[PDB]
Design a protein around this ligand. Structure first.
Ligand SMILES: [Mg+2]
Ligand SMILES: [Mg+2]
Ligand SMILES: [Mg+2]
Ligand SMILES: [Mg+2]
Ligand SMILES: [Mg+2]
Ligand SMILES: [Mg+2]
Ligand SMILES: [Mg+2]
Ligand SMILES: [Mg+2]
Ligand SMILES: [Mg+2]
Ligand SMILES: [Mg+2]
Ligand SMILES: [Mg+2]
Ligand SMILES: [Mg+2]
Ligand SMILES: [Mg+2]
Ligand SMILES: [Mg+2]
Ligand SMILES: [Mg+2]
Ligand SMILES: [Mg+2]
Ligand SMILES: [Mg+2]
Ligand SMILES: [Mg+2]
Ligand SMILES: [Mg+2]
Ligand SMILES: [Mg+2]
Ligand SMILES: [Mg+2]
Ligand SMILES: [Mg+2]
Ligand SMILES: [Mg+2]
Ligand SMILES: [Mg+2]
Ligand SMILES: [Mg+2]
Ligand SMILES: [Mg+2]
Ligand SMILES: [Mg+2]
Ligand SMILES: [Mg+2]
Ligand SMILES: [Mg+2]
Ligand SMILES: [Mg+2]
Lengths: 86, 137, 71, 23, 208, 116, 96
RNA sequence: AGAGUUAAAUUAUAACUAAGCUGUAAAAAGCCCUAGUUAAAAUAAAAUAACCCACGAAAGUGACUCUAAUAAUCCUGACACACGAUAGCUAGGACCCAAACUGGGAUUAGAUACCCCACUAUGCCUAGCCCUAAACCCAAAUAGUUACAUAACAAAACUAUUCGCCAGAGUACUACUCGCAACUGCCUAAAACUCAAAGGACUUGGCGGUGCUUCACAUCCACCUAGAGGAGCCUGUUCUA
């Protein structure tokens, strides 16, 4: 509002394909959480409720992170087995 | 071909024109896309309104005007009324998160109007006024 | 880290939004991530550095952070 | 499970508050 | 299903078997057909090698048939084709050289064209949402559309004729009226199209 | 890098106050979850709307606009072909990853030890 | 594993180095025992479930005139012997 | 704890432009002194950083700046002393926005609810009260050990020094007392009587208007064909007889 206009959350379209520009914008906003934030501010969410969410999210993230880590570590051993029909 | 996603700052020497105008001189298409309705207003760079079209203006009624189709129809209409007053290129400003966002944009293109830049200015409070309570107690 | 140089600060901001990046992006000792945050907010209110967007001048400086928007 | 205990107290208290209003 | 899934449908076309030597992939294909020691369902009584049979005419014949009467329905079809024919021969000799160049006398091409004109583009499916049944615009498969055409024809020329009036008469009438797009059948098609525009917003409820 | 687990959970030894309250214990399971099937949305809606405009304008005579009819048809064909052919390849190829069956087997070959 | 620490000579850069003096001490004893069981005409059963050496071990056993189980070990094989193997059976006198 | 300050929103208020705007699973009611854009004080609340885990005795504290500042040469300890979320009370000031209550609109058999719109007490500041919370990390403070050792579940098992508590379930966060700026209050806290259980954790079922996958092949929806439900008869039920 007091900032200069058009410098922010702005994407310029290339070779006239708009769908792509918009996609890029939406990716920018998804990445910075602006989208989730917008969506979550439609209604209010009482502090305890928010505390609970943050905690659940962080648990969830820890688990996904670690499972992923174990996948990428175990990934080598998916290769065809040498010892078949031993 | 060097193509910057970032717009052309005013103080810069930067030379790009669309029909001979600077990036600053191009008209602005404001689009407010809200959950029950989508409104569009094309305006001069100098902020004189050229054209206005909304899903209500387009003769949909209560729930139907929520949908994407409606939004697109408003887009086309807006662009017609706009090209009448002779605006070839327009910079989109999308305000709000709704069912009609993308649709009203590509309706602006469908309706024979050229979109150069598409900006999102959605109110994001940094915590001002408390929004209304949640649904289903 | 000094609130007075907006250049260094403006490195750890998102160009489009003006958000401050997390550790998992900037990759800083907790100490510095903190110093950076505090310095940023200080700058923003003393009127050195813009809040909602990364100042366009500093767009082409070196990119330290791990985020990729355009794919 | 435990709520059965709580529920009981809950009821008691309600009924009593009600009564203080009448009485 | 007195045929196991092993049994392939027969290919009745004579032209396919008569002139093989110019196509590689198809030679390979029917080579694999018979040489697979593949079982073939016995060719049905309806279908023939006849140079004269139109599968669309036969379908229509069937949809007209009540009970078990092919003889009667094939009668009514035959009579209807003959009736369109003679109606156009009547319209030909009372006309002038220009209109004698214009007017179509092939009852087959008339049948086909009259069905192509009467087939709907878009359609409606009921969808339950929030305890209400909304009618929603649905794109249709080809077969569904042809079906809708034929069924609408027959339903009208069964239902709306005066009891004195015979079937091949009314049917030839409606075939010729649908040839020129002014038939009541076509009005039905339009009622659908208009109901589909009235509801176009609801096109979002469709999830597929 | 994984978020820190030190000091987070409520335990007899921990000096401070809980940060996480996990709903179910944080122990890597020996299988992964099954991929969530994509929510469908309506297809061809744009071409439909264009055709409907063409009709409203030309008074619903089909002869008038053959292009939008034909293109709406073309599109519905591409949505049928899409529904048929995408199901199988989305159900097999995960791109850089493995089908959840193979992942589960791989994870049973090198399981987590909660016990001992 | 916790119970192994007495047998570790130590840990070199993260690897655990078993103490060979003790390995020799023990191995002498195991071999001694094995041998005396063999001399006394008793059944020896080599057991491993590791699929590299499975063939190697099955081979080895067949060459000593001793038995090998290298495969999946059925549930009640030792405890419920007479059902899995047969009506009356001898069970291994030693298992390696 | 003070004092000072404000970026993003939001709003009084004008200026253009448009007839609608708002609102839902869908509507209605409301508003058109409305809506979009451009300008904007006050008030209130503090995106991102935070995938951090710091400060405080606890309650609590995460916009910015400065001033003052975080007891004990560190054992336990009250009914004494000083604090103590939200709500609430008194008085004065504020009021963007939210909102018990209430009034409208739907919904429903009803709807004194859930859903929609308006608006109030109240949420804010100053001063004083009130002293309660699932004030729960349901895990007392201070030193320690990882020895012995699995009821179950949960956050593994234990020593020493202390203090506070607990003797079936109801009755009962009740009745009577004492004290208290509390006067529909807090605190303290019985008995008659009634029962032969009340509780805790688990197990297998069954169920679930719970979620995720996969299906239905005359089969639920989509769809196809012929019928029934209306007529006369035929024949069977129920009634009445
Ligand atoms: Mg509640
Ligand atoms: Mg009671
Ligand atoms: Mg502490
Ligand atoms: Mg739990
Ligand atoms: Mg401001
Ligand atoms: Mg005011
Ligand atoms: Mg009204
Ligand atoms: Mg803030
Ligand atoms: Mg201290
Ligand atoms: Mg003390
Ligand atoms: Mg208090
Ligand atoms: Mg108060
Ligand atoms: Mg007051
Ligand atoms: Mg008020
Ligand atoms: Mg309100
Ligand atoms: Mg009411
Ligand atoms: Mg004060
Ligand atoms: Mg608390
Ligand atoms: Mg307690
Ligand atoms: Mg104590
Ligand atoms: Mg006891
Ligand atoms: Mg008692
Ligand atoms: Mg109480
Ligand atoms: Mg009391
Ligand atoms: Mg007493
Ligand atoms: Mg059936
Ligand atoms: Mg009958
Ligand atoms: Mg009937
Ligand atoms: Mg009857
Ligand atoms: Mg009887």
């Amino acid at each position: 509002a007091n900032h200069l206009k058009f410098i922010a959350r702005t994407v310029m379209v290339q070779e006239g394909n708009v769908e792509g520009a918009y996609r890029t914008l939406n990716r920018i906003l998804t990445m910075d959480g602006l989208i989730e934030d917008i969506k979550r501010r439609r209604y209010y969410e009482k502090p305890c409720r928010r505390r609970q969410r943050e905690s659940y999210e962080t648990c969830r993230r820890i688990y996904n992170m670690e499972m992923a880590r174990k996948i990428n570590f175990l990934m080598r051993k998916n290769r065809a087995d040498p010892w078949q029909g031993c | 071909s060097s193509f910057s996603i970032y717009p052309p700052i005013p103080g810069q020497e930067n030379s790009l024109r669309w029909a001979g105008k600077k990036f600053e001189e191009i008209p602005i298409a404001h689009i407010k896309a809200s959950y029950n309705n989508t409104q569009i207003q094309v305006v001069s760079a100098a902020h004189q309104p050229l054209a206005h079209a909304s899903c209500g203006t387009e003769g949909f009624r209560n729930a139907k005007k929520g949908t994407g189709i409606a939004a697109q129809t408003a887009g086309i209409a807006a662009a017609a009324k706009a090209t009448g007053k002779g605006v070839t290129h327009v910079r989109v400003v999308v305000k709000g998160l709704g069912p009609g966002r993308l649709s009203a944009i590509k309706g602006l293109t469908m309706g024979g109007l050229e979109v150069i830049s598409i900006t999102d200015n959605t109110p994001i409070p940094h915590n001002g006024c408390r929004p209304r309570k949640a649904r289903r107690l | 880290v000094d609130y007075k140089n907006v250049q260094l600060l403006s490195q750890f901001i998102s160009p489009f939004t003006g958000c401050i990046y997390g550790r998992h992006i900037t990759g800083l000792c907790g100490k510095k991530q903190k110093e950076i945050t505090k310095a940023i907010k200080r700058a923003q209110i003393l009127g050195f550095m813009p809040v909602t967007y990364k100042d366009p001048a500093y767009l082409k400086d070196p990119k330290v952070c791990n985020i990729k928007y355009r794919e | 499970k435990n709520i059965l205990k709580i529920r009981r107290r809950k009821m008691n208290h309600h009924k009593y508050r009600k009564l203080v209003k009448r009485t | 299903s007195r045929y196991g899934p092993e049994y392939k449908d027969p290919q009745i076309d004579k032209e396919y078997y008569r002139k093989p030597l110019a196509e590689q992939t198809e030679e390979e294909k029917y080579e694999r057909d018979f040489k697979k020691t593949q079982l073939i369902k016995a060719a049905p009584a309806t279908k023939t090698s006849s140079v004269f049979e139109d599968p669309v005419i036969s379908k229509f014949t069937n949809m007209m048939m009540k009970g078990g009467n092919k003889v009667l329905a094939r009668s009514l079809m035959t009579q209807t084709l003959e009736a369109v024919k003679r109606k156009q021969f009547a319209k030909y000799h009372a006309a002038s050289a220009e209109e004698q160049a214009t007017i179509e006398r092939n009852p087959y091409t008339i049948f086909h064209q009259a069905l192509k004109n009467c087939e709907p583009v878009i359609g409606l499916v009921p969808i339950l949402k929030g305890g209400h049944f909304y009618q929603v615009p649905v794109p249709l498969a080809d077969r569904r559309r042809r079906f809708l055409a034929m069924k609408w024809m027959i339903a009208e020329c069964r239902e709306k004729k005066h009891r004195r009036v015979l079937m091949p008469e009314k049917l030839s009438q409606e075939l010729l009226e649908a040839f020129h797009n002014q038939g009541p059948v076509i009005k039905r098609k339009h009622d659908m199209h208009k109901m589909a525009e009235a509801n176009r917003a609801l096109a979002h409820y469709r999830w597929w | 890098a994984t978020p820190s687990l030190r000091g987070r959970l409520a335990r007899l030894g921990n000096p401070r106050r809980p940060i996480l309250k996990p709903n179910k214990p944080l122990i890597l399971a020996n299988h992964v979850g099954e991929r969530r099937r994509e929510k469908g949305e309506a297809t061809c809606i744009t071409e439909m709307s264009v055709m409907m405009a063409c009709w409203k304008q030309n008074e619903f005579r089909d002869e008038a606009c053959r292009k939008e009819i034909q293109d709406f048809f073309d599109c519905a064909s591409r949505a049928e072909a899409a529904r048929k052919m995408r199901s199988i390849q989305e159900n097999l190829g995960e791109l850089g990853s493995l089908p959840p069956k193979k992942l589960n087997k791989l994870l049973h070959r090198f399981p987590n030890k909660p016990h001992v | 594993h916790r119970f192994m620490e007495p047998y570790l000579f130590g840990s070199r850069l993260g690897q655990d180095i078993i103490d060979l003096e003790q390995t020799a001490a023990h191995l002498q004893l195991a071999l001694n025992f094995t041998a005396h069981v063999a001399y006394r005409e008793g059944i020896i059963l080599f057991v491993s479930r590791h699929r590299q050496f499975a063939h190697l071990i099955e081979t080895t056993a067949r060459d000593c005139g001793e038995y090998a189980h290298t495969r999946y070990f059925k549930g009640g094989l030792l405890t419920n012997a007479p059902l899995l193997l047969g009506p009356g059976v001898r069970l291994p006198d030693l298992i390696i």
